[PDB]
Design a protein around this ligand. Structure first.
Ligand SMILES: Nc1ncnc2c1ncn2[C@@H]1O[C@H](COP(=O)(O)OP(=O)(O)NP(=O)(O)O)[C@@H](O)[C@H]1O
Ligand SMILES: Nc1ncnc2c1ncn2[C@@H]1O[C@H](COP(=O)(O)OP(=O)(O)NP(=O)(O)O)[C@@H](O)[C@H]1O
Ligand SMILES: [Mg+2]
Ligand SMILES: [Mg+2]
Lengths: 804, 172, 225, 225
């Protein structure tokens, strides 16, 4: 009986378009969620591999073995590493070397590359850094005395995965087996030996052992993972996670808006059927069962189709992007499934609940003749309830993150602005006279039904502002990362350079065809008093440890002056904004520094932005030339060179007192991480843009379906196809222009809030958005409407299709 | 009478205020009779110490000078001949300018390598005998078996060890 | 005996300037078995008066009693039950289902009454074939003419088998022969089953055929024939 | 002189068993100024025959010439231009816009013709007031009766001001007085502007008033009056 009902209704155009929109939204949301979850899992896995473990425990001495026995009983894999330093001897030449000792478990995660590759730390042989090998002029197969024991040299080490990203490890790397350490006899009380403990396994047992060890923790022990790290890479990972969550939120909201519009259209369509079924006096239970059964069948079919399409789409995307993708990601969870299904069902139910009870109470005739409906549940109370419910649901889904607060603030400000500007536009248009035909036609169409115009305007505006926010955030993140990592960054550093030694060093660089950058002077001084008040007792790190003051002559390139003037004059200093805030220092304040038992005062005359993520040298204070000439000055410099290693040994022999630092491996790893995340973000933004375009197309098609009867009446009367296309172009272009105009301010507000309280970056207004968004949205909507109208106008005897 | 201190963060004060460092504590203990002034700077080399030497010598002009340098040079690793010659020149300059040098016997940690540790530790008695100056012992060994007196790195003693260091130096 | 009673029924539509007064107090007494015709001009309120007489809407004021039950005192559920029990209605635009065929459209009330598919389909087929619609069983209302849709609505009303039947413009879109056949069928049903009939049409002959004739002038009913 | 010419026009709807033959070859000659009435029974094909005569649809076979132009040889754009230039049509369900009021509905063709708002609104108001619809300017078709909707459709057709007017059931939902007024207005327009009129109705008197009368039997036209 009802099977034929549903089969015939599935062919009906309105139900067909509603079901298509629902299925497309479900599929796109599910695919996006699965892709985001798999990308996040891959990022976590690669972070663990970079850390060579899942949990890290660093100790200065020996921890009790009973805890490791408990971990073994729990099944977690635990590995011990011992790091220290020694003074080895290439014949007579002494040299410091950073010795590391691991078991066979290492590498627990990631991969270790040696020279030749494939070598592993084994007994009877040791490994040296290529820089160390060149410095000691040894080679593979040689025997060297490390500590107090002589062992053969297995080879060089290309790179170790667990090498800390610390640009201060001056000691060259030495590697030896953990069993041979007692051969050297270096294990003695009072030795600076660091015990690293790597833990790997399923997160359930990880949490179990973590909570088991929590009461047993000691101050000498540092237990952590990777997200808790304050390193720049960890913060970037957190930002990427927040970006993925924001993308999920945006696609969820777009799906919500699309399905809300579809449900509104469906409920308005069902009016005639409701009226006729109520006319025959059908039982309330019977009619309720019929209507809810049809609605639930539509929802179930849409959900099944969306799930199948999402799975197929994810498989196709993984197949296509595999060469671009680093490796096969681990499978994701089923949480996106529940997210999408619950979102769809809840939104549809909340949209359709009020009309159902309203038609139950209202008499069928008043519905048929559009008489005054029963004054029950006015929209003035219905809308706030819906807003509160959806806000609570989103907060429960995403744990009440501040980004959700920013998004909802943007949404509400967009809604109020849309309402006010719509009222003003209605007044002005009623005060406006025209002369062209399609303009007047579009004006009339807008004026006749203002509420549908407001709804479509709000939907288009929210979609446009969400897309603009996504694009702007992606562009800002990419630009900031590109600024932070110049591709021409130097790969070697020279420190502890003497002022008398720079000229021989400069000649050495010039002979070696090396163009050096600015030679940073360094003076070690402490900010003792601020505004004649001593800083002792303050727990701020800058007021407790030593400060590295410096002077320059050219304006900083990566530190534009936000407040103040460049350059600072005599007794004047350019200060960092963050330090000024954290030390309650304003412009013009007197800062007193003590260095080399010499006290000097300066006036804060310039506030500057400093990003510690930048690999360039950064300072909390900048002085003009001549401010600290009398203070003792060391010198720091950096250069890029990859041609051979003999010149490095020659420089070390010529300048033994000058410290040499290698950062090549760290630079390579951070570049790999940044490019991987950049590819991930680019793919994510492309797919989100595609889904947003599809949803906008669905909404425009819904609007065309709603205007189908009047369009077909016009065509029946004899309206030209060119005239209809121009009218649609004008109407949808005006709609898109207004939507983009309001979306500009909405996106500005949301971006300001999120950048202030999520991404911790300075906010700037962009007039380029204010110009591009309205015209671009208008063009997109006009093209979509023109294509849809061109498709609809095709056919013969279209007047017979007026009813449908 | 004034005592000038010229060394590393062991006396400069690693990640602590100027008053938090042990030389300030010793000055507080010796306010009445003999003031103590600290001129130590972290990370200095023998050449950098020589460069900073004239300014401190002219600014302070003390009766005694505490010269504890080369420990960080040994930690980073210098060839014995070069650092020995530089320290010899520094001591000659200190004794030339009417200032009594105080050389601290520094012994590298036993894990640093027995041969180099012995070679570097044997320098200090030779210099003390040559210049006829007292050689106070390596009191960081007294901190070797005191984890509560050290930090996470194990290189610099914590603020809790600073009173102990000041007391030990007052005894010496 | 009196199945329909009306006292001071008034209806007004609109607000302020848009407000319009349709009725000025209606008094009507109708017993079982009567044939009542309504006459007037277009826009005079015959359709809305018939609709509120059927109890589907509430007027501005007045008392309406159907089969000795106060419809205004009842709720929508009781009125729906009464309609499903003894009331049938025929509109002007035929209010037909676009997604259903004629046979299913006429069989639907019997299915809603819990009758089995076989007997309901047989009765629907008989009602359609006696109206000459046996060749349009699978056709849709959009695929059919206005007269065919009117006949489908009449067949659905017949399938309802009510004791009271309100119809508006039953033969407006029919030729003389089809109108005569429909009138003969309606009169035969009224004479056999005793079903009260209230028809609104502009056909003077059909109106005269009714037992009583009322003209709607200035929101008031006047006996005419 | 002959404005409408029909040769062997045939129309068939359906496929296979569902296939139905509507026309069996139509030959028709109509000059300017004639009044043509169409008679028959419901479902006989009068509506579809009139619609394909207006050129809105293509039959199974045949030649149709309107104002001396082969409609079958033209595209949809040319037919739309011809309709906007000289053709007006009146349906059975009045095909009215639910989201527009009567005044805007009748003013719409003049606006589509590029006329200014003031003159178009004045003409629409005159057409509505001469039909007695001056008190329902702001009312919606759902708010109005079927006769009011029919009058709105007729007023829209009048606002089109065509040289040829096809109408189906022009006075079906009207009383005698309103039907007489509409017929008088149509005849006056035909006699003044020379506009050809082709009306399909079941009113025998109105059909006899026309210059020619054709009955549609078994998909064929027969002269009757
Ligand atoms: N919802 C409404 N809003 C405004 N006016 C209305 C509404 N419903 C009815 N009216 C007015 O009441 C009149 C009567 O409607 P109706 O009962 O259909 O007239 P009628 O004379 O029975 N027409 P017919 O049966 O076609 O000859 C309408 O024509 C309007 O003038
Ligand atoms: N889409 C369709 N599918 C199937 N049959 C159709 C379709 N359209 C029309 N028909 C058939 O063709 C017949 C003629 O339609 P129509 O032209 O409305 O008849 P008519 O005699 O002009 N009716 P009326 O004007 O109400 O007296 C219909 O009644 C159906 O039998
Ligand atoms: Mg009426
Ligand atoms: Mg017809």
């Amino acid at each position: 009986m009802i099977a034929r009902w549903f089969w015939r209704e599935w062919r009906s155009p309105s139900l067909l378009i509603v079901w298509l929109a629902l299925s497309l939204a479900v599929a796109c949301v599910l695919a996006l969620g699965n892709i985001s979850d798999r990308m996040e899992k891959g990022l976590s896995q690669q972070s663990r591999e970079f850390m060579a473990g899942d949990r890290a425990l660093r100790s200065s001495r020996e921890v009790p073995q009973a805890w490791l026995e408990e971990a073994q009983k729990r099944g977690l894999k635990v590995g011990k590493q011992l790091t220290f330093a020694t003074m080895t001897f290439a014949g007579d030449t002494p040299q410091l070397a950073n010795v590391k000792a691991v078991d066979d478990i290492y590498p627990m995660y990631g991969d270790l590359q040696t020279n030749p590759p494939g070598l592993k730390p084994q007994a009877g042989s040791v490994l040296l850094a290529p820089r160390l090998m060149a410095l000691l002029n040894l080679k593979t197969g040689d025997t060297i005395d490390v500590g107090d024991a002589t062992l053969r040299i297995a080879g060089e080490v290309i790179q170790e995965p667990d090498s800390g990203f610390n640009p201060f490890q001056m000691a060259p790397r030495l590697m030896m087996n953990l069993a041979d350490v007692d051969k050297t006899g270096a294990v003695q009380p009072g030795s600076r030996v660091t015990w690293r403990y790597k833990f790997g396994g399923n997160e359930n047992q990880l949490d179990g052992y973590e909570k088991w060890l929590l009461p047993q923790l000691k101050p000498e022990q540092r237990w952590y993972g990777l997200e808790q790290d304050e390193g720049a890479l960890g913060r970037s990972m957190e930002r990427s996670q927040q970006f993925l969550l924001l993308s999920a939120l945006l696609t969820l909201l777009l799906a919500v808006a699309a399905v809300a519009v579809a449900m509104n259209h469906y409920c308005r369509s069902r009016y005639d059927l409701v009226a006729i079924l109520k006319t025959l006096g059908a039982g309330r239970a019977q009619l309720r069962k019929l209507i809810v059964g049809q609605w639930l069948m539509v929802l179930t079919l849409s959900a099944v189709t969306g799930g199948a399409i999402g799975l197929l789409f994810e498989n196709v995307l993984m197949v296509l992007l595999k060469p671009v993708l680093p490796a096969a990601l681990p499978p994701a969870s089923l949480w996106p499934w529940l997210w999408a299904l619950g979102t769809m069902t809840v939104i549809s139910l909340l949209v359709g609940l009020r009309p159902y009870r309203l038609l139950l109470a209202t008499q069928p005739l008043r519905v048929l003749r559009n008489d005054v409906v029963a004054n029950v549940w006015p929209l003035k109370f219905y809308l706030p309830i819906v807003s509160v419910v959806v806000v609570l649901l989103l907060a429960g889904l995403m744990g009440g993150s501040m980004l959700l607060w920013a998004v909802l603030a943007g949404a509400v400000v967009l809604a109020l602005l849309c309402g006010v500007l719509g009222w003003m536009l209605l007044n002005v248009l009623r005060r406006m006279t025209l002369k062209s035909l399609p303009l007047r036609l579009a004006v009339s169409r807008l004026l006749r039904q203002p509420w549908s115009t407001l709804s479509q305007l709000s939907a288009f505006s929210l979609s446009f502002m969400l897309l603009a926010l996504l694009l702007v955030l992606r562009g800002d993140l990419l630009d900031r990362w590109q600024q932070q990592l110049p591709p021409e960054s130097p790969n070697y550093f020279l420190i502890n350079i003497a002022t008398e030694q720079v000229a021989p060093l400069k000649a050495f660089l010039a002979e070696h065809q090396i163009v050096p950058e600015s030679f940073y002077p360094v003076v070690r001084a402490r900010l003792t008093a601020i505004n004649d008040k001593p800083t002792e007792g303050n727990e701020d790190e800058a007021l407790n440890r030593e400060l590295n003051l410096t002077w320059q002559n050219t304006r900083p390139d990566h530190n534009p002056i936000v407040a103040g003037n460049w350059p600072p004059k005599a007794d004047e200093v350019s200060m960092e904004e963050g330090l000024a805030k954290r030390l309650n220092v304003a412009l013009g304040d007197t800062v007193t520094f003590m260095g080399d038992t010499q006290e000097f005062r300066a006036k804060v005359t310039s506030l500057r932005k400093v990003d510690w993520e930048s690999l360039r040298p950064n300072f909390y204070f900048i002085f003009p030339e001549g401010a600290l000439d009398g203070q003792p000055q060391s010198w720091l410099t950096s250069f890029r060179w990859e041609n051979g290693n003999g010149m490095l040994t020659q420089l070390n022999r010529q300048f033994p007192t000058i410290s040499l630092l290698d950062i090549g491996a760290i630079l390579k790893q951070v570049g790999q991480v940044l490019e991987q995340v950049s590819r991930a973000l680019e793919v994510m933004v492309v797919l989100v843009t595609a889904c947003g375009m599809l949803l906008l197309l669905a909404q425009v098609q819904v609007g065309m379906r709603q205007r189908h009867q009047e369009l077909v009446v016009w065509r029946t009367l004899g309206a030209g196809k060119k005239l209809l296309r121009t009218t649609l172009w004008c109407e949808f272009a005006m709609l898109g222009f207004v939507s983009g105009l309001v979306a500009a301010i909405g996106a500005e507000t949301a971006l300001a809030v999120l950048q202030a309280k999520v991404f911790d970056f300075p906010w700037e207004p962009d007039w380029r958005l204010w110009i591009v968004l309205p015209c671009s949205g208008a063009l997109l909507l006009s093209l979509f409407g023109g294509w849809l109208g061109a498709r609809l106008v095709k056919g013969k005897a279209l007047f017979r299709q007026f009813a449908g | 009478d004034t005592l000038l201190i010229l060394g590393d963060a062991l006396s400069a004060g690693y990640r602590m205020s100027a008053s938090a460092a042990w030389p300030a504590l010793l000055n507080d203990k010796w306010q009445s009779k003999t003031s103590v002034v600290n001129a130590s700077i972290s990370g200095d080399t023998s050449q950098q110490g020589l460069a900073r030497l004239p300014a401190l010598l002219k600014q302070h002009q003390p009766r005694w000078v505490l010269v504890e340098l080369g420990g960080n040079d040994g930690l980073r690793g210098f060839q014995p001949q070069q650092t020995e010659q530089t320290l010899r020149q520094i001591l000659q300059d200190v004794k030339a300018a009417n200032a009594e040098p105080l050389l601290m016997q520094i012994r590298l940690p036993a894990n640093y390598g027995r041969r180099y540790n012995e070679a570097f530790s044997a320098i200090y008695p030779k210099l003390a005998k040559e210049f006829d100056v007292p050689l106070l012992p390596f009191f960081m060994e007294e901190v070797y078996l005191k984890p509560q007196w050290m930090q996470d790195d194990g290189i610099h003693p914590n603020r809790d060890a600073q009173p102990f260091i000041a007391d030990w130096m007052a005894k010496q | 005996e009196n199945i329909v009673e009306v006292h001071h029924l008034k209806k007004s539509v609109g607000q302020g300037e848009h407000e319009l007064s349709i009725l000025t107090g209606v008094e009507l007494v109708v017993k079982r078995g009567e044939t009542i015709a309504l006459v007037g001009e277009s826009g005079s309120g015959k359709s809305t008066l018939l609709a509120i007489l059927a109890g589907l809407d509430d007027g501005s004021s007045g008392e309406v009693s159907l089969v000795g039950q106060p419809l205004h005192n009842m709720d929508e559920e009781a009125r729906a039950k009464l309609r499903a029990k003894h009331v049938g209605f025929v509109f002007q635009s035929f209010m037909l289902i676009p997604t259903l065929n004629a046979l299913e459209n006429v069989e639907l009330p019997a299915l809603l009454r819990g009758e089995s598919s076989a007997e309901s389909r047989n009765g629907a087929k008989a009602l359609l074939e006696q109206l000459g619609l046996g060749k349009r069983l699978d056709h849709l209302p959009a695929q059919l003419s206005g007269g065919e849709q009117q006949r489908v609505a009449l067949a659905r009303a017949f399938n309802g088998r009510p004791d009271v039947l309100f119809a508006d413009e039953p033969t407006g879109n029919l030729d003389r022969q089809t109108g005569d056949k429909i009138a003969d069928l309606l009169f035969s049903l009224n004479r056999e089953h005793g079903t009260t009939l209230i028809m609104v049409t502009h056909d003077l002959q059909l109106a005269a055929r009714c037992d009583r004739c009322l003209r709607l002038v200035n929101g008031q009913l006047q006996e005419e024939a």
